[PDB]
Subunit: 146 residues, 3 copies
C-alpha cells in the first residue's frame, strides 16, 4: 500500500542517505589521519568522527522502528515530521561531535526529544488500538458474573 | 493494515524501549566511571556495560527483521511470543553481562534459542509460501514433456 | 499482503542468516585467539574478523530499509536481485577482510554498488510516487492565478 506509507518511506530513504554521508566522512577521516582498518583508534579528532558515525548507526534502527510504528498507528504526517526533525538533529550531532565532544550535546538532546516523541506517538497509537478491546473483554467478563 | 500486525508493532516498541534503557545505562556508567566520549575503554566494569549495550544493538535489527517476517508469514501471535522471550532474555543478558562477563552466557543462550526459533518460523512460513508454486512449475514442465 | 513482498522477505531472511554466520565466526575467532569479552582488541587477525562483522552489522539496517522501499516503490524482483548481489558481496567482504584488510576492498566496492543501486531504485520509485501530485499542485496554483 504505497499510498499510506510513502512519507514514511521518503523519511526512511533520507535517513539512509544521511547514514551513507556519515560513512563517507569516516572514510575521509581514515585517509586524512592515515588510520587503516582494522584500527578504530587514533587521534581524538579521528575517534570523534568514527564515534559520531557509530552512535548514529546504532540508533538508526530505533528511529526506523519508531517512525514506522508511529506513522502507521498514530498519524503518517506527524511521524514523518518528527522523523525529519530527528534526522536534522542527527546531522548536527555528527557535525558537532566531529568538531568537539562537547558540541555533540545540544543536538544529541534535540535528537532524543524527537525520538521520545516518536516513541510516545507509537505508544499512544498502540494504546488506542488495544485498550478498547481489552477494557471490553474485561467488562464482558464482569457482566457474565454480575 | 493495523489489524494483522499490531502485536508485532507492540513487541517492536517494547524492543525500542529496552534499547533506550540500555543506552541510558551506558550514559549512567560513563558518568560513574568518568569515561568521556569518544572513549569506549576504561575499567572492565564500564567496558562490560558498554559492550552489553553494543551487542544488544547489533542484534536488534536481526530481531526486528525476523519478528516481522515470522509474524507475517507464519503466525502473528507465535512470532510476538518468541519476540517477548527474546527481549526478556536480552534484558537478563544486559543485567548479567554488566555484573560479569560470565553471567552473560545463560541469558545469551536463551536469547539465541528465541531468535533461532523466529528464524525457523520465518523460514517455514516462506517455504509454505514458495514451495508449492515451485513444485507446481516443476511438474508443469515435466508434464509438458511427458 | 504476503503476495507482494515475499521475495523481499526471503532476501531479508537470507540477510539475517548471513549476519548469524558472521556472529558465529567472531565467536570462533574469540575462542581461537582466546580473546574474552569485553575485549574487542587482540592480534590483527582477530580484530579483522571482529571488524568485518561489525561493519556488516552497521550497514545491515541500510540494506533492509532500502531493500523494502525499492521493492515496494520500484519493483519487487529488481530490489530482491540487487539485495542478493549485495549479500553475496558482503559474504565476500567478510571472507576477504578476515584474510587481510586489503582483500576487503574489491567486495566492499561491489557491495557499495549494489546498495547505491537499491538507493537509486528507491529514490526513483518515490519520485514517481510524489512528483506528479506535486507538479499538479504547482500547476493548479498557477492556473488559479492565470
Ligand atoms: N554507545 C553509546 C550509548 C550511550 C549514548 O548514546 N551516549 C551519548 C551521550 S554520552 C553519546 O553521545 N555517546 C557518544 C558515543 O557513542 O561515542 C555510548 O557509548 O555512549
Ligand atoms: N560483536 C560480537 C559478535 C559475536 C557475539 O555475539 N558473541 C557473544 C558470545 S562471545 C557475546 O556475548 N559477545 C560479547 C560482546 O559483544 O561484547 C562479539 O564481539 O563477540
Ligand atoms: N565504521 C566504518 C565506516 C566507514 C566504512 O564502511 N569504511 C570501509 C572502508 S575504510 C571499511 O571497510 N571499514 C572497515 C571497518 O569498519 O572495520 C569504519 O570504521 O571505517
Amino acid at each position: 500500500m504505497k499510498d499510506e506509507v510513502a512519507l514514511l518511506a521518503a523519511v526512511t530513504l533520507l535517513g539512509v542517505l544521511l547514514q551513507a554521508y556519515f560513512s563517507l566522512q569516516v572514510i575521509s577521516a581514515r585517509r586524512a589521519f592515515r588510520v587503516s582498518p582494522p584500527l578504530t583508534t587514533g587521534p581524538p579528532e579521528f575517534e570523534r568522527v568514527y564515534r559520531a558515525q557509530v552512535n548514529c548507526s546504532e540508533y538508526f534502527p530505533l528511529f526506523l522502528a519508531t517512525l514506522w510504528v508511529a506513522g502507521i498507528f498514530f498519524h503518517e504526517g506527524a511521524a514523518a515530521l518528527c522523523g525529519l526533525v530527528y534526522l536534522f538533529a542527527r546531522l548536527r550531532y555528527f557535525q558537532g561531535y566531529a568538531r568537539s565532544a562537547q558540541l555533540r550535546l545540544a543536538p544529541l538532546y534535540a535528537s532524543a526529544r524527537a525520538l521520545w516523541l516518536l516513541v510516545a506517538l507509537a505508544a499512544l497509537g498502540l494504546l488506542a488500538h488495544f485498550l478498547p478491546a481489552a477494557l471490553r473483554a474485561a467488562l464482558l467478563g464482569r457482566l457474565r458474573t454480575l
